[PDB]
Ligand binder design. Structure first.
Ligand SMILES: *[C@@H]1O[C@H](CO)[C@@H](O[C@@H]2O[C@H](CO)[C@@H](O[C@@H]3O[C@H](CO[C@H]4O[C@H](CO[C@H]5O[C@H](CO)[C@@H](O)[C@H](O)[C@@H]5O)[C@@H](O)[C@H](O[C@H]5O[C@H](CO)[C@@H](O)[C@H](O)[C@@H]5O)[C@@H]4O)[C@@H](O)[C@H](O[C@H]4O[C@H](CO)[C@@H](O)[C@H](O)[C@@H]4O)[C@@H]3O)[C@H](O)[C@H]2NC(C)=O)[C@H](O)[C@H]1NC(C)=O
Ligand SMILES: *[C@@H]1O[C@H](CO)[C@@H](O[C@@H]2O[C@H](CO)[C@@H](O)[C@H](O)[C@H]2NC(C)=O)[C@H](O)[C@H]1NC(C)=O
Ligand SMILES: *[C@@H]1O[C@H](CO)[C@@H](O[C@@H]2O[C@H](CO)[C@@H](O)[C@H](O)[C@H]2NC(C)=O)[C@H](O)[C@H]1NC(C)=O
Ligand SMILES: *[C@@H]1O[C@H](CO)[C@@H](O[C@@H]2O[C@H](CO)[C@@H](O)[C@H](O)[C@H]2NC(C)=O)[C@H](O)[C@H]1NC(C)=O
Ligand SMILES: *[C@@H]1O[C@H](CO)[C@@H](O[C@@H]2O[C@H](CO)[C@@H](O)[C@H](O)[C@H]2NC(C)=O)[C@H](O)[C@H]1NC(C)=O
Ligand SMILES: *[C@@H]1O[C@H](CO)[C@@H](O)[C@H](O)[C@H]1NC(C)=O
Ligand SMILES: *[C@@H]1O[C@H](CO)[C@@H](O)[C@H](O)[C@H]1NC(C)=O
Ligand SMILES: *[C@@H]1O[C@H](CO)[C@@H](O)[C@H](O)[C@H]1NC(C)=O
Ligand SMILES: *[C@@H]1O[C@H](CO)[C@@H](O)[C@H](O)[C@H]1NC(C)=O
Lengths: 204, 153, 53, 216
């Protein structure tokens, strides 16, 4: 009968900032920090108690049913995921990044090479570079017709200096529809960009 | 009562040593390991109706061991000699040791499964020493009173 | 208050308590914490079920 | 000190069985429960079960019950324990990273975790990839790698000379059952037409190395 929740899991703070994450559980709760694809490390056990070999900035508040994790004067290596653990129930956690790095994405379009079609495989990609936040709505139009299910999307890690992301969306189409027309566009709307930016290419 | 809105279902032990998966005990020097799987699986969904049956006797098969390592790494290993004749014990069952199976979050179909066995040997003695606490008597008390010690002249 | 306990049999068993002392009121379910599956549950009965081996 | 060393990654076929190992050597191993967690791709951890080192008694949830089987094997004097997970009937949704954690107290706090064992189950055994260039029109340009198995493949430019501005996207598992990715680097627009750029891919499990020039 253990009910637990987690923060909206999308929050951004700059370097040297203070951040708090809240959980609402009804059992012995612990606070773990996990990196990308790494063994998670325990930070706090029993709500507030601090573990040996942990930076002093982490602290815990046990009030009511709410558990608070507070991190002070954030360092660049603390950008990770954090989750609160109860006996056998674990929430996915929260996502961390740096704020105020809003920018218009750089749009790149690359038509499939001629030697790719010789194997009977068609793959069209629209590249997004230097954009923030990560959440971007990428829509594919084949002459103003939405394509669903045939696109694979990935986002690179937050780079060290610019703290910007880059997205790759691959659209897979049949040979018949790609070679029959000329113009194809992958327009993306982003909070960073002020106007719809589209990249084109001339066959020649 | 402790699990209000779920059905209670027993299941046999899921693995481990032979001292865990099978009811282990002793008679006259011979060490018995009884199966006990007919005692420990069933389902109790809602007690919708009372089901009447006929009298039955449950026969649990039992193995017998001689090289006994009672305590895993602290007790001396022992070899129990065979006992001549026929062995017969009549004993009481005054308790059960269960272990709840862990639950998940994505989907709990209102069921809880308890499998017998589990615990260490200490739980066989907590069942007896749960009423008792040892205390130390402090028989020296100090309280104010209107009496004063007669000072000698 | 007592000077010392009742008779305690050192009988050793694994899945079912044998030769024990019956509960007085009813079935009593005892565990260190009932919301921690790593903790064993002791169900102590108020009426014996003889086992004949 | 504690050294919860875990075995390496495993790749098998659906319907097979994989035994994931875990080794503990640097403490009083008999007094702490060893739990097993699994992590789906890009998802939070998930409970699998705990095993008592003294008696070997496991405990698994409903969905995992019947398939998974946790086991331990002690040394001659219990100074070194080995913990194994036999996961019978490997189905599609079993591609996950597996951790052997060590419970420390009654709060279920795990101070020590294992390194991890990536277990993936599918057909299409190890094979060479297909490399596709991107025709150029500061800007960015790169190569694409397709239909390789299994991970990983690394793309290097100019034979281990250029690594600035590289954006190697994480690989994606398509419906076919193979792996693909695209690696692009930034380069000034004046360098195009004057510099020769090559992308080199090394696929150790398939022992295939492919270097391809990118030209307009
Ligand atoms: C198995 O393990 C689990 C742990 O995993 C364990 O769970 C504990 O269970 C006990 C009892 O079931 C819990 O204790 C109770 O906690 C109640 C809530 O405590 C909170 O609220 C206190 C008051 O805050 C008021 O205001 C807030 C909003 O601000 C509101 O939400 C609250 O409801 C409340 O109205 C607060 O003081 C308390 O803080 C605790 O911790 C701090 C730091 O450790 C300490 O300084 C405090 O003094 C306090 O202990 C917490 O924030 C609480 O209301 C309740 O109090 C009743 O009993 C006392 C004593 O009888 C009376 O004086 C009081 O008037 C109430 O009648 C009681 O304290 C405990 O919180 C659980 N722990 C966890 C982690 O979940 C199980 O018990 C275990 N099972 C077994 C069998 O052992
Ligand atoms: C206790 O007895 C039961 C049967 O009453 C055993 O359960 C069988 O175990 C075998 C071993 O693989 C299975 O093939 C059977 O399907 C099981 N069920 C039946 C009805 O036979 C159980 O294994 C015994 N206990 C131990 C520890 O062996
Ligand atoms: C097994 O249980 C039975 C019944 O619970 C016991 O029989 C009674 O035990 C009490 C002990 O409190 C005696 O006072 C009674 O005289 C016994 N007989 C009856 C008819 O009540 C029996 O003693 C138990 N066996 C052991 C070895 O303890
Ligand atoms: C042992 O304890 C059980 C409680 O679990 C008793 O069962 C109750 O018996 C009364 C008899 O008046 C019934 O009215 C209740 O409905 C029973 N409870 C349940 C949950 O079935 C039982 O009587 C006790 N036996 C002895 C000898 O003390
Ligand atoms: C314990 O078991 C023994 C033998 O298994 C029982 O003694 C036999 O009980 C049966 C029951 O029908 C009789 O037919 C036999 O005549 C008895 N003697 C022999 C030598 O077999 C004994 O009664 C059992 N005890 C209890 C309390 O059930
Ligand atoms: C602590 O938790 C409370 C909820 O009880 C929340 O309102 C608050 O923002 C958290 N942080 C601080 C610093 O109080
Ligand atoms: C739980 O069981 C009680 C008694 O059987 C019943 O009244 C109640 O509706 C059930 N459900 C909940 C959520 O309490
Ligand atoms: C009890 O035994 C098995 C144990 O798994 C269970 O599946 C079955 O439904 C029950 N009854 C019989 C007769 O086996
Ligand atoms: C002893 O021998 C058994 C069977 O030959 C084997 O399983 C075990 O690993 C050996 N070593 C120890 C320490 O038991």
């Amino acid at each position: 009968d253990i009910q637990m929740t987690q923060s909206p899991s999308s929050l951004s703070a700059s370097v040297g900032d203070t951040v708090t994450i809240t959980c609402q559980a009804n059992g012995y709760l612990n606070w773990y920090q996990q990196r990308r694809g790494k063994a998670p490390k325990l930070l706090i056990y029993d709500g507030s108690k601090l573990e040996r070999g942990v930076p002093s900035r982490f602290s815990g508040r046990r009030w009511g049913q709410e558990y608070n994790l507070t991190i002070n004067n954030l360092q660049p290596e603390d950008i990770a995921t954090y989750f609160c653990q109860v006996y056998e129930f674990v929430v996915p956690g929260t996502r961390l990044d740096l704020k105020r790095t809003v920018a218009a994405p750089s749009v790149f379009i690359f038509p499939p090479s001629d030697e790719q079609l010789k194997s009977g495989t068609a793959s069209v990609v629209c590249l997004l570079n230097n954009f923030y936040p990560r959440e971007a709505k990428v829509q594919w139009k084949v002459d103003n017709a939405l394509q669903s299910g045939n696109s694979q999307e990935s986002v690179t890690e937050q780079d060290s200096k610019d703290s910007t992301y880059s997205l790759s969306s691959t659209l897979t189409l049949s040979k018949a529809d790609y070679e029959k027309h000329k113009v194809y566009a992958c327009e993306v709307t982003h909070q960073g960009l002020s106007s719809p930016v589209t990249k084109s290419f001339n066959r020649g | 009562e402790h699990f209000p809105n779920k059905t209670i279902s027993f299941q046999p032990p899921s693995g481990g040593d032979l001292e865990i998966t099978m009811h282990h005990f002793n008679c006259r020097g011979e060490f018995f390991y009884c199966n006990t799987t007919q005692l420990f699986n069933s389902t109790w969904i809602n007690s919708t109706t009372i089901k009447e049956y006929n009298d039955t006797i449950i026969y649990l098969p039992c193995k017998i061991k001689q090289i006994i390592n009672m305590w895993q790494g602290v007790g001396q290993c022992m070899y129990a000699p065979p006992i001549r004749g026929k062995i017969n014990c009549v004993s009481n069952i005054t308790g059960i040791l269960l272990t709840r199976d862990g639950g998940d979050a994505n989907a709990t179909n209102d069921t809880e499964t308890f499998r017998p066995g589990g615990g260490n040997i200490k739980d066989n003695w907590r069942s007896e020493l749960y009423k008792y606490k040892v205390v130390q008597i402090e028989p020296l008390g100090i309280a104010p009173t209107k009496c004063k010690r007669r000072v000698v002249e | 208050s007592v000077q010392c306990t009742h008779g305690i049999k050192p009988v050793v068993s694994t899945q079912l308590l044998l030769n024990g002392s019956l509960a007085e009121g009813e079935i009593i379910i005892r565990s260190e914490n009932l919301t921690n599956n790593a903790k064993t549950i002791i169900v102590h009965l108020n009426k014996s079920v003889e086992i004949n081996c | 000190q504690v050294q919860l060393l875990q075995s390496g990654a495993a790749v098998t076929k659906p319907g097979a069985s994989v035994r994931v190992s875990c080794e503990a050597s640097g403490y009083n191993i008999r007094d702490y429960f060893i739990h097993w967690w699994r992590q789906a791709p890009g998802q939070g951890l998930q409970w699998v079960g705990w095993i008592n080192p003294k008696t070997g008694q496991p405990n698994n949830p409903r969905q995992f019950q019947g398939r998974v089987s946790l086991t331990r094997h002690a040394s001659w004097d219990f100074d070194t324990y080995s913990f194994y997970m036999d996961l019978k009937a490997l189905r599609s949704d079993d591609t996950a990273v597996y951790f052997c954690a060590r419970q420390r107290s009654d709060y279920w706090d795990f101070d020590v975790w294992g390194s991890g064992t990536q277990v993936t189950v599918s057909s299409a055994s190890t094979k060479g990839p297909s490399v596709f260039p991107l025709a150029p029109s500061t800007a960015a340009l790169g190569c694409l790698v397709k239909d390789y198995f299994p991970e990983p493949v690394t793309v290097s430019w100019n034979s281990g000379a250029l690594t600035s501005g590289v954006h190697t996207f994480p690989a994606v598992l398509q419906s076919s059952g193979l792996y693909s990715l695209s690696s692009v680097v930034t380069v000034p627009s004046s360098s195009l037409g004057t510099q020769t750029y090559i992308c080199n891919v090394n696929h150790k499990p398939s022992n295939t190395k492919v270097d391809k020039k990118v030209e307009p």
